[PDB]
Amino acid sequence: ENLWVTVYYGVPVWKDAETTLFCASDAKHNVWATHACVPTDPNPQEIHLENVTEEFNMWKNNMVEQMHTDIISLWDQSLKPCVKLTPLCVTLQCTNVTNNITDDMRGELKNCSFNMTTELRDKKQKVYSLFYRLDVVQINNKEYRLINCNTSACTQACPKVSFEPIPIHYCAPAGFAILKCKDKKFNGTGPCPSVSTVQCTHGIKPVVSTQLLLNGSLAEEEVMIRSENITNNAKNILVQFNTPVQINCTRPNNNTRKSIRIGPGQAFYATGDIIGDIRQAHCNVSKATWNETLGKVVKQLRKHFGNNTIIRFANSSGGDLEVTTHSFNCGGEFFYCNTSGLFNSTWISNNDSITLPCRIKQIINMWQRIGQCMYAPPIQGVIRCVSNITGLILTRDGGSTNSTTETFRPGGGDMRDNWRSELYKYKVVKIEPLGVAPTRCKRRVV
Amino acid sequence: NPQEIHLENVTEEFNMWKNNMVEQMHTDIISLWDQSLKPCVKLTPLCV
Amino acid sequence: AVGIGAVFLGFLGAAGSTMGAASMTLTVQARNLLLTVWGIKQLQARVLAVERYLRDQQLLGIWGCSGKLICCTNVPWNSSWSNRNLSEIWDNMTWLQWDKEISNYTQIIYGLLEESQNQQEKNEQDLLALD
Amino acid sequence: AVGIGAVFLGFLGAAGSTMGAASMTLTVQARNLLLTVWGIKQLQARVLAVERYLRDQQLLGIWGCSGKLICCTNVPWNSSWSNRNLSEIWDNMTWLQWDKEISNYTQIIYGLLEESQNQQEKNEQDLLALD
Amino acid sequence: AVGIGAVFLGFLGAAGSTMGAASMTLTVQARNLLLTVWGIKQLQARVLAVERYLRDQQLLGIWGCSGKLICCTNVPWNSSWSNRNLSEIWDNMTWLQWDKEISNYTQIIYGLLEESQNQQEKNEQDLLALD
Amino acid sequence: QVQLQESGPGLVKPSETLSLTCGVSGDSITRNYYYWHWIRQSPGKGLEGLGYIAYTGGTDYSPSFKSRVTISRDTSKNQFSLKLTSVTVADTAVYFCARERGDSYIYSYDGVDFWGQGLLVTVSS
Amino acid sequence: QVQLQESGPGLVKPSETLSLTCGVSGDSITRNYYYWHWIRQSPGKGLEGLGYIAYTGGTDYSPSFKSRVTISRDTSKNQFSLKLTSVTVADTAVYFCARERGDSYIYSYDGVDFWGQGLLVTVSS
Amino acid sequence: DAVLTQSPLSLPITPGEPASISCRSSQSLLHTNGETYLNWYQQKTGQRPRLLISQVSKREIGVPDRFSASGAGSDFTLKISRVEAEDVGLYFCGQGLHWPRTFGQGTRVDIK
Ligand SMILES: *[C@@H]1O[C@H](CO)[C@@H](O[C@@H]2O[C@H](CO)[C@@H](O[C@@H]3O[C@H](CO[C@H]4O[C@H](CO)[C@@H](O)[C@H](O)[C@@H]4O)[C@@H](O)[C@H](O[C@H]4O[C@H](CO)[C@@H](O)[C@H](O)[C@@H]4O)[C@@H]3O)[C@H](O)[C@H]2NC(C)=O)[C@H](O)[C@H]1NC(C)=O
Ligand SMILES: *[C@@H]1O[C@H](CO)[C@@H](O[C@@H]2O[C@H](CO)[C@@H](O[C@@H]3O[C@H](CO)[C@@H](O)[C@H](O)[C@@H]3O)[C@H](O)[C@H]2NC(C)=O)[C@H](O)[C@H]1NC(C)=O
Ligand SMILES: *[C@@H]1O[C@H](CO)[C@@H](O[C@@H]2O[C@H](CO)[C@@H](O[C@@H]3O[C@H](CO)[C@@H](O)[C@H](O)[C@@H]3O)[C@H](O)[C@H]2NC(C)=O)[C@H](O)[C@H]1NC(C)=O
Ligand SMILES: *[C@@H]1O[C@H](CO)[C@@H](O[C@@H]2O[C@H](CO)[C@@H](O[C@@H]3O[C@H](CO)[C@@H](O)[C@H](O)[C@@H]3O)[C@H](O)[C@H]2NC(C)=O)[C@H](O)[C@H]1NC(C)=O
Ligand SMILES: *[C@@H]1O[C@H](CO)[C@@H](O[C@@H]2O[C@H](CO)[C@@H](O[C@@H]3O[C@H](CO)[C@@H](O)[C@H](O)[C@@H]3O)[C@H](O)[C@H]2NC(C)=O)[C@H](O)[C@H]1NC(C)=O
Ligand SMILES: *[C@@H]1O[C@H](CO)[C@@H](O[C@@H]2O[C@H](CO)[C@@H](O[C@@H]3O[C@H](CO)[C@@H](O)[C@H](O)[C@@H]3O)[C@H](O)[C@H]2NC(C)=O)[C@H](O)[C@H]1NC(C)=O
Ligand SMILES: *[C@@H]1O[C@H](CO)[C@@H](O[C@@H]2O[C@H](CO)[C@@H](O[C@@H]3O[C@H](CO)[C@@H](O)[C@H](O)[C@@H]3O)[C@H](O)[C@H]2NC(C)=O)[C@H](O)[C@H]1NC(C)=O
Ligand SMILES: *[C@@H]1O[C@H](CO)[C@@H](O[C@@H]2O[C@H](CO)[C@@H](O)[C@H](O)[C@H]2NC(C)=O)[C@H](O)[C@H]1NC(C)=O
Ligand SMILES: *[C@@H]1O[C@H](CO)[C@@H](O[C@@H]2O[C@H](CO)[C@@H](O)[C@H](O)[C@H]2NC(C)=O)[C@H](O)[C@H]1NC(C)=O
Ligand SMILES: *[C@@H]1O[C@H](CO)[C@@H](O)[C@H](O)[C@H]1NC(C)=O
Ligand SMILES: *[C@@H]1O[C@H](CO)[C@@H](O)[C@H](O)[C@H]1NC(C)=O
Ligand SMILES: *[C@@H]1O[C@H](CO)[C@@H](O)[C@H](O)[C@H]1NC(C)=O
Ligand SMILES: *[C@@H]1O[C@H](CO)[C@@H](O)[C@H](O)[C@H]1NC(C)=O
Ligand SMILES: *[C@@H]1O[C@H](CO)[C@@H](O)[C@H](O)[C@H]1NC(C)=O
Ligand SMILES: *[C@@H]1O[C@H](CO)[C@@H](O)[C@H](O)[C@H]1NC(C)=O
Ligand SMILES: *[C@@H]1O[C@H](CO)[C@@H](O)[C@H](O)[C@H]1NC(C)=O
Ligand SMILES: *[C@@H]1O[C@H](CO)[C@@H](O)[C@H](O)[C@H]1NC(C)=O
Ligand SMILES: *[C@@H]1O[C@H](CO)[C@@H](O)[C@H](O)[C@H]1NC(C)=O
Ligand SMILES: *[C@@H]1O[C@H](CO)[C@@H](O)[C@H](O)[C@H]1NC(C)=O
Ligand SMILES: *[C@@H]1O[C@H](CO)[C@@H](O)[C@H](O)[C@H]1NC(C)=O
Ligand SMILES: *[C@@H]1O[C@H](CO)[C@@H](O)[C@H](O)[C@H]1NC(C)=O
Ligand SMILES: *[C@@H]1O[C@H](CO)[C@@H](O)[C@H](O)[C@H]1NC(C)=O
Ligand SMILES: *[C@@H]1O[C@H](CO)[C@@H](O)[C@H](O)[C@H]1NC(C)=O
Ligand SMILES: *[C@@H]1O[C@H](CO)[C@@H](O)[C@H](O)[C@H]1NC(C)=O
Ligand SMILES: *[C@@H]1O[C@H](CO)[C@@H](O)[C@H](O)[C@H]1NC(C)=O
Ligand SMILES: *[C@@H]1O[C@H](CO)[C@@H](O)[C@H](O)[C@H]1NC(C)=O
Ligand SMILES: *[C@@H]1O[C@H](CO)[C@@H](O)[C@H](O)[C@H]1NC(C)=O
Ligand SMILES: *[C@@H]1O[C@H](CO)[C@@H](O)[C@H](O)[C@H]1NC(C)=O
């Protein structure tokens, strides 16, 4: 047998690589720009790849880091045209609010008054505003100052742009492609026996959460556990539900908005006088649904440490308010709920709603960026919110030879964990259409 | 010396109020005008 | 319409098929190769794709296959590179596994092909000079 | 100098001329195909022009006419696309009209050309395999 | 290993050698052709490199050489340009000196090649159309 | 252009074999990527496919007619025929021999391009 | 596979000439870009390159042996030989005939690929 | 079997007003390779059927621009931008993916 080498162009070969993805949306104003995103395909094409298996892997794909960087860039870009609150750092004289106050809300809101600049630079005006206990500190009718007057001047978010988390599609550029795993019983890592090629990923909701994942993609047949190293308790534990549980959150206070013209073409949306009664913000979740969900999680988690062992749930150990409480934004108000009423029970082998209070905060510095901050203006009217819970960022506690009562605790201050639960199915690859193989042809002679 | 070539035996449907040339020119004028005022001083301390 | 005859598959759908059957769909893969910071990001991706395509085209241009997907060459295949049957490679293997096995000898084959084509060009020009 | 013989004309200056007479001026049109915000605009324009030229060359490359402005193909012309005599097209029609008349059937002809080239490529490779 | 036979040299290593000896290293020169402000500058450099390569490839494409490092054309040489001996150029002159000498007559040869290619193409089409 | 015509008896008695022969002109029966079907239609019930023969010579039939339909080909005369055994009164319908577009490797084409005149087969005792 | 095989006398007295012949099989001596060397190995002194003959027919000898070594080729039978005059007792060593890699105009290749079986030459009386 | 069901069963329309027909499929017609295989047909009174639109929205040669279609997944529709007096006859929606092939029961069109 006589053989000669032959080169073929356009062979189906690929290799792992890193690239810069681009956004795509329907383009139907909000915090997310959505203007740089090119129009999306009306119906993305999906091609199933049979007779091939790929080595999918999480905690290493550059897609999560790229998405995180893009979200930060969009968030920073959306704050540039807004006004900065630098001349607001002055001495604030505050007094406790006592107009129809309640025991669960006493000492939380303060009525402050202070001097402030007007349109004309050669004059000053006296105004008053309402501020929460978390946005002010004492000085040493008492003087107070904002929590950020010694860190940086916050920039208030423009009222025209909302915080609606519209879906965004990520599409691979020319010469690259993204592979999705169609396996229903897929694990966090390992080989995927059902790969498929798609031009653009599904609608990913860029929801910002810290403890409980919400408004995400639910499982299709059963609960799943995700972790880089189950034995190593230093790594966070990710769990995805198969059925949702509704949470009814609200802000019963019927506050009002007031506009203070602090300068030429600049204004400050202060918190006006609150009318009607005053109550503390809270969220409601069904007891039976949560009980059943926790039971399913315990059943699905007992296969990793044994059947005889028992596990317990406890509240957060401590740290900053951004990690010890469940934070989210419903419309225009950022909540901070006390999840201690949910992670408190014991499980052993083999009237209908839970209420948890939530605190409101204005001076909020998103991400782990302490150098700059943003000021959330007060939303006029009563705030009502409803959502579906999708996952929990659990973390384990060091255990001795006891080998029982494995204590689990929530956490996950970082934001990559939230997007990892949505990008676990995709991976970007680079195609190589140049191949080499032998053939019996010798080529003509001229 | 710009080159101009005449096209014989052909006609084209011209139509104003729809060509993107006017919008592109307007956008360019706005961009140049805004860029030209960047190094100038702000008159904010004069409002007295 | 699908049937017992030929199938169409999709973009890279022939990856699981054998080399012999995947060689018939070489056109589909080859025909699909083509806020200021965002503008930079998009232009970078576009230029990267253009450069990769031009790189492959340049490699084909150096050899005697400047304009065809399937072309033969004159250098023979040394048995040490694979020592495997012809029928078993085309009818019992896929491009991914073959690429994995021949990846350790791609540079040598490319250099041999380039040198052979250069020598063939010199020989053809010398022969043509007589006429 | 201008005279009763040939005429130079200019870039896209033979549009009004018939197809038979304008087919001799293909090279002139083919050879002419090649403050941070302003940089982005000019770069976008240049990249788009290069992408357009590359797409045209890729389309020619897929067919067996990768290196010639005028070539021939083995797939005939079905009468249903034009049903008009040959002389009336080259000697009594222009490119703008012929292009507007075939505009609805260009995609089908493109697919036929690509399929014909793929079949000829495999037939030629199989025939040359005897050597 | 270096020896009394052939020599490898490097990129632009035959610039000081004669044309005959430098014609064997045509492949090494051809294979080497391929903070927002800095991104613009880097993209400008890459785009310029791509336009230059595309322009060279386009010029080669217009002529009767689709793609190859050495090719022949069907037009006789005119002594008016050089008038120098044949062997005296290849065996006693480098590429730089020859380029400097023919620099004042490149546009004429570039136009003659295009003319000959157009005539050859139309003649070949007419010849093939008698089937 | 392509012309398809049917041929066969206009009336068939119950339980014997029914033979229909369709002649194809204007194109080769052995085209590289095309299929040929046999579809019938009765009043109000709509169309229904019986079976088909591919260019490679293979055949495939509907699950409700595997034990009754049979298709053969003859490239020498450029035609194909269908044999139906154990015909009943319920099979009374007009039979058509049509041509459809099969997906190629490079592209995908779908649809029935042309149809035949239609031989009205009457079953009576 | 390419194989080399040496040949020549085993015992050579002092003061006369020495002659060795190395055969080549599986490859042509007229290869476009390859060389053929002659190397000897002795204890303590190490390896020494006597000389080599290029594909062009030219020969290059080492400075310490240029006055005594001589190499010639015979392309008709695909073999080459070496002749060494004024042999001394210090020349008693094992001789090797090996092939090398020349630097092509396009790429540079270095490395001795194949060696002979090492015929032992004993210079004594 | 992929039973195609059309709606409405009848559609009396006069020249000068638009018309539309809907065709639902029991099984999804999106093939594994990412291509749809639905076709539309027209059959006049006592005449052979003829194809109008192929591959959901690719118009067939010789078919006027008056016909149009769009859809994906399991919901597809046929919309006629302009109807004339010679557009009488049945209309069928057929799939070319699941064997045996099936067609709708047939929507009748006549003058009101
Ligand atoms: C998770 O997903 C849930 C969806 O289930 C989200 O819940 C939605 O939250 C948004 C707030 O971000 C709600 O939108 C707002 O609704 C207000 C009242 O809605 C009623 O009235 C409208 C008619 O206008 C009805 O369609 C609706 O069904 C209700 O009956 C509006 O007053 C708001 O409009 C104001 O704000 C927008 C900007 O936000 C301005 O542009 C407007 O001009 C106006 O000033 C706004 O539309 C939405 O109703 C909620 N959906 C549901 C089903 O309740 C969660 O927000 C999401 N995220 C989280 C973290 O849970
Ligand atoms: C995935 O792999 C399977 C094999 O595990 C592929 O199925 C195989 O497809 C080939 C197609 O040529 C079949 O060959 C045919 O077999 C019949 C019956 O012998 C013969 O008459 C034909 O002439 C041809 O030789 C093969 O039998 C079949 N094997 C099995 C087990 O079904 C499948 O096509 C692969 N799919 C992809 C997308 O790669
Ligand atoms: C092509 O080259 C690569 C890298 O040069 C080769 O991969 C290497 O393969 C060897 C096996 O031959 C691996 O060695 C390992 O040794 C340990 C200890 O003995 C053993 O426990 C492992 O099971 C494995 O055999 C090596 O890790 C691997 N990778 C690298 C980077 O060296 C590959 O085998 C070559 N393929 C061919 C066909 O030559
Ligand atoms: C623009 O349109 C005019 C009018 O059609 C063109 O002039 C005409 O060109 C045709 C084609 O060459 C001439 O036909 C030929 O004339 C010669 C004699 O000159 C005759 O021997 C041939 O058999 C043929 O009849 C035609 O006479 C000429 N003049 C007129 C009045 O029709 C003109 O060439 C067009 N120019 C461009 C740039 O399109
Ligand atoms: C290629 O396709 C285009 C678009 O599908 C065709 O253009 C369209 O042609 C029709 C005629 O067939 C035009 O209809 C017009 O309707 C009015 C009112 O009834 C009538 O007065 C006109 O005489 C004409 O019939 C239609 O406007 C036109 N454009 C569009 C956007 O639909 C074109 O005809 C096709 N070419 C070929 C050769 O098939
Ligand atoms: C730099 O210039 C020197 C001087 O010209 C070059 O050396 C020359 O190299 C050529 C080979 O291309 C020699 O030609 C050949 O010499 C052998 C000698 O036996 C002869 O048999 C051949 O027929 C042919 O004439 C040439 O003699 C030699 N000149 C010398 C040594 O004075 C050198 O290659 C140049 N280097 C570069 C990088 O350009
Ligand atoms: C190709 O054309 C260029 C011009 O485009 C020629 O360059 C020119 O060469 C002449 C000499 O032939 C230079 O003239 C100078 O004259 C003064 C006064 O007599 C003398 O002192 C200088 O030594 C020099 O000879 C001229 O400056 C130079 N440049 C220009 C722009 O004209 C070149 O010679 C031509 N080459 C060939 C081969 O025709
Ligand atoms: C917050 O403080 C302001 C300023 O002291 C209060 O505004 C005054 O309220 C009194 C009592 O109703 C009025 O008589 C005054 O006319 C108000 N204005 C001023 C400028 O003094 C305001 O009522 C306080 N709000 C709450 C909830 O305690
Ligand atoms: C706002 O500015 C006014 C004017 O400077 C302050 O009023 C003075 O306050 C000091 C200290 O309390 C007194 O000694 C003066 O007699 C006040 N002057 C007048 C005209 O009232 C005022 O304290 C500043 N702060 C607030 C919250 O109003
Ligand atoms: C005012 O509220 C603070 C907490 O916000 C509390 O510590 C303080 O005792 C209160 N003072 C009065 C007089 O009620
Ligand atoms: C700013 O003030 C707060 C409250 O006193 C304090 O906790 C924080 O450390 C201060 N930051 C700096 C940088 O001094
Ligand atoms: C996923 O697979 C790896 C390797 O088989 C295994 O070590 C890991 O425990 C699996 N994940 C889970 C959650 O079991
Ligand atoms: C996980 O962590 C343990 C230590 O807790 C370590 O021994 C082990 O190698 C790590 N990796 C895996 C895959 O178990
Ligand atoms: C939550 O439940 C409590 C139970 O007393 C009820 O008073 C409150 O109105 C509920 N809130 C919502 C938003 O359903
Ligand atoms: C809140 O106050 C506004 C004042 O205009 C009133 O119209 C609205 O009904 C109030 N809502 C509630 C829930 O009290
Ligand atoms: C939340 O409010 C919705 C209002 O539509 C209600 O249907 C649902 O039962 C409530 N859930 C809980 C847990 O209170
Ligand atoms: C869940 O419901 C069961 C009812 O059978 C009850 O016994 C159990 O205590 C509940 N769990 C919790 C944590 O309340
Ligand atoms: C735990 O119990 C389940 C259900 O009885 C069983 O399937 C599983 O194998 C058990 N695991 C161990 C480690 O015994
Ligand atoms: C919640 O965690 C904090 C951490 O300091 C702890 O003090 C508190 O007791 C916990 N809540 C309950 C109900 O144990
Ligand atoms: C959450 O509620 C528990 C219930 O006792 C309480 O002990 C804890 O302090 C609360 N968390 C915070 C941050 O106040
Ligand atoms: C925590 O659970 C225990 C279980 O007995 C219960 O007694 C206690 O009241 C719970 N505490 C909270 C804050 O839910
Ligand atoms: C919540 O779940 C229900 C039932 O699965 C679904 O209908 C609803 O759209 C979901 N809401 C969100 C915001 O995902
Ligand atoms: C092995 O490689 C050599 C290159 O040194 C080549 O000459 C020879 O032809 C190859 N063997 C076969 C059987 O092709
Ligand atoms: C292919 O390889 C096998 C070894 O698995 C061998 O038995 C067979 O003879 C080979 N085929 C040919 C044609 O040599
Ligand atoms: C041109 O075509 C028409 C119609 O097909 C025909 O009547 C006429 O004779 C043709 N002219 C020539 C010169 O063939
Ligand atoms: C010089 O150019 C002319 C152009 O007609 C050509 O005929 C001639 O052959 C060329 N030179 C020679 C003598 O080859
Ligand atoms: C080359 O040029 C030299 C120098 O004038 C001349 O003597 C010789 O005759 C010319 N021709 C040839 C063929 O060497
Ligand atoms: C279309 O062209 C093909 C290929 O020549 C031919 O077989 C077919 O009959 C033609 N159809 C028509 C209607 O001309």
PDB file of N, CA and C in Angstrom, chain C residues 37-67:
ATOM      1  N   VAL C  37     -15.727  51.828  24.341  1.00  0.00           N
ATOM      2  CA  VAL C  37     -14.981  50.604  24.760  1.00  0.00           C
ATOM      3  C   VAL C  37     -15.637  49.391  24.095  1.00  0.00           C
ATOM      4  N   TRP C  38     -16.972  49.357  24.063  1.00  0.00           N
ATOM      5  CA  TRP C  38     -17.691  48.240  23.397  1.00  0.00           C
ATOM      6  C   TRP C  38     -17.296  48.199  21.920  1.00  0.00           C
ATOM      7  N   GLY C  39     -17.290  49.355  21.249  1.00  0.00           N
ATOM      8  CA  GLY C  39     -16.872  49.391  19.862  1.00  0.00           C
ATOM      9  C   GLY C  39     -15.511  48.751  19.690  1.00  0.00           C
ATOM     10  N   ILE C  40     -14.597  49.028  20.629  1.00  0.00           N
ATOM     11  CA  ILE C  40     -13.264  48.434  20.593  1.00  0.00           C
ATOM     12  C   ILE C  40     -13.365  46.923  20.748  1.00  0.00           C
ATOM     13  N   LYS C  41     -14.227  46.462  21.661  1.00  0.00           N
ATOM     14  CA  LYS C  41     -14.420  45.028  21.887  1.00  0.00           C
ATOM     15  C   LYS C  41     -14.931  44.317  20.634  1.00  0.00           C
ATOM     16  N   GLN C  42     -15.899  44.936  19.945  1.00  0.00           N
ATOM     17  CA  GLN C  42     -16.450  44.322  18.741  1.00  0.00           C
ATOM     18  C   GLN C  42     -15.436  44.343  17.607  1.00  0.00           C
ATOM     19  N   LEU C  43     -14.728  45.466  17.429  1.00  0.00           N
ATOM     20  CA  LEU C  43     -13.726  45.540  16.370  1.00  0.00           C
ATOM     21  C   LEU C  43     -12.601  44.543  16.624  1.00  0.00           C
ATOM     22  N   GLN C  44     -12.228  44.342  17.897  1.00  0.00           N
ATOM     23  CA  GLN C  44     -11.185  43.376  18.234  1.00  0.00           C
ATOM     24  C   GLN C  44     -11.613  41.974  17.831  1.00  0.00           C
ATOM     25  N   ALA C  45     -12.875  41.617  18.121  1.00  0.00           N
ATOM     26  CA  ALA C  45     -13.360  40.289  17.746  1.00  0.00           C
ATOM     27  C   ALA C  45     -13.395  40.120  16.226  1.00  0.00           C
ATOM     28  N   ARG C  46     -13.860  41.153  15.511  1.00  0.00           N
ATOM     29  CA  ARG C  46     -13.929  41.098  14.048  1.00  0.00           C
ATOM     30  C   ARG C  46     -12.540  40.958  13.427  1.00  0.00           C
ATOM     31  N   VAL C  47     -11.579  41.763  13.898  1.00  0.00           N
ATOM     32  CA  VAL C  47     -10.214  41.707  13.380  1.00  0.00           C
ATOM     33  C   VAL C  47      -9.579  40.360  13.709  1.00  0.00           C
ATOM     34  N   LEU C  48      -9.892  39.796  14.885  1.00  0.00           N
ATOM     35  CA  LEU C  48      -9.350  38.491  15.254  1.00  0.00           C
ATOM     36  C   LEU C  48      -9.849  37.411  14.300  1.00  0.00           C
ATOM     37  N   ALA C  49     -11.150  37.444  13.978  1.00  0.00           N
ATOM     38  CA  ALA C  49     -11.719  36.469  13.049  1.00  0.00           C
ATOM     39  C   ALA C  49     -11.107  36.616  11.658  1.00  0.00           C
ATOM     40  N   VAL C  50     -10.950  37.866  11.200  1.00  0.00           N
ATOM     41  CA  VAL C  50     -10.364  38.137   9.887  1.00  0.00           C
ATOM     42  C   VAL C  50      -8.923  37.643   9.833  1.00  0.00           C
ATOM     43  N   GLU C  51      -8.147  37.905  10.892  1.00  0.00           N
ATOM     44  CA  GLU C  51      -6.755  37.469  10.943  1.00  0.00           C
ATOM     45  C   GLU C  51      -6.647  35.951  10.930  1.00  0.00           C
ATOM     46  N   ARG C  52      -7.516  35.261  11.685  1.00  0.00           N
ATOM     47  CA  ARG C  52      -7.484  33.797  11.707  1.00  0.00           C
ATOM     48  C   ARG C  52      -7.801  33.217  10.331  1.00  0.00           C
ATOM     49  N   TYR C  53      -8.813  33.787   9.656  1.00  0.00           N
ATOM     50  CA  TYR C  53      -9.177  33.310   8.327  1.00  0.00           C
ATOM     51  C   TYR C  53      -8.048  33.566   7.337  1.00  0.00           C
ATOM     52  N   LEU C  54      -7.438  34.759   7.396  1.00  0.00           N
ATOM     53  CA  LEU C  54      -6.337  35.075   6.494  1.00  0.00           C
ATOM     54  C   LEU C  54      -5.131  34.196   6.782  1.00  0.00           C
ATOM     55  N   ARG C  55      -4.953  33.783   8.042  1.00  0.00           N
ATOM     56  CA  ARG C  55      -3.843  32.908   8.404  1.00  0.00           C
ATOM     57  C   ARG C  55      -4.008  31.557   7.728  1.00  0.00           C
ATOM     58  N   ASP C  56      -5.222  30.994   7.820  1.00  0.00           N
ATOM     59  CA  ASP C  56      -5.494  29.709   7.177  1.00  0.00           C
ATOM     60  C   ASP C  56      -5.367  29.823   5.659  1.00  0.00           C
ATOM     61  N   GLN C  57      -5.866  30.930   5.093  1.00  0.00           N
ATOM     62  CA  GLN C  57      -5.769  31.153   3.653  1.00  0.00           C
ATOM     63  C   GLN C  57      -4.318  31.293   3.211  1.00  0.00           C
ATOM     64  N   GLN C  58      -3.487  31.952   4.027  1.00  0.00           N
ATOM     65  CA  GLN C  58      -2.071  32.105   3.709  1.00  0.00           C
ATOM     66  C   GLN C  58      -1.374  30.752   3.725  1.00  0.00           C
ATOM     67  N   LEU C  59      -1.695  29.920   4.728  1.00  0.00           N
ATOM     68  CA  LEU C  59      -1.105  28.585   4.819  1.00  0.00           C
ATOM     69  C   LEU C  59      -1.464  27.764   3.589  1.00  0.00           C
ATOM     70  N   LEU C  60      -2.720  27.862   3.139  1.00  0.00           N
ATOM     71  CA  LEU C  60      -3.125  27.143   1.934  1.00  0.00           C
ATOM     72  C   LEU C  60      -2.467  27.745   0.695  1.00  0.00           C
ATOM     73  N   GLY C  61      -2.232  29.060   0.714  1.00  0.00           N
ATOM     74  CA  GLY C  61      -1.605  29.736  -0.412  1.00  0.00           C
ATOM     75  C   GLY C  61      -0.160  29.333  -0.625  1.00  0.00           C
ATOM     76  N   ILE C  62       0.584  29.127   0.471  1.00  0.00           N
ATOM     77  CA  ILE C  62       1.985  28.710   0.374  1.00  0.00           C
ATOM     78  C   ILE C  62       2.081  27.361  -0.333  1.00  0.00           C
ATOM     79  N   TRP C  63       1.118  26.480  -0.082  1.00  0.00           N
ATOM     80  CA  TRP C  63       1.082  25.182  -0.728  1.00  0.00           C
ATOM     81  C   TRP C  63       0.387  25.331  -2.084  1.00  0.00           C
ATOM     82  N   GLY C  64       0.188  24.215  -2.777  1.00  0.00           N
ATOM     83  CA  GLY C  64      -0.459  24.248  -4.075  1.00  0.00           C
ATOM     84  C   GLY C  64      -1.961  24.065  -4.006  1.00  0.00           C
ATOM     85  N   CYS C  65      -2.587  24.621  -2.971  1.00  0.00           N
ATOM     86  CA  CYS C  65      -4.027  24.522  -2.741  1.00  0.00           C
ATOM     87  C   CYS C  65      -4.608  25.881  -2.382  1.00  0.00           C
ATOM     88  N   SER C  66      -4.254  26.897  -3.169  1.00  0.00           N
ATOM     89  CA  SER C  66      -4.711  28.261  -2.926  1.00  0.00           C
ATOM     90  C   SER C  66      -6.216  28.439  -3.094  1.00  0.00           C
ATOM     91  N   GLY C  67      -6.889  27.569  -3.847  1.00  0.00           N
ATOM     92  CA  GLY C  67      -8.315  27.746  -4.046  1.00  0.00           C
ATOM     93  C   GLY C  67      -9.205  26.519  -4.061  1.00  0.00           C
TER      94      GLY C  67
END
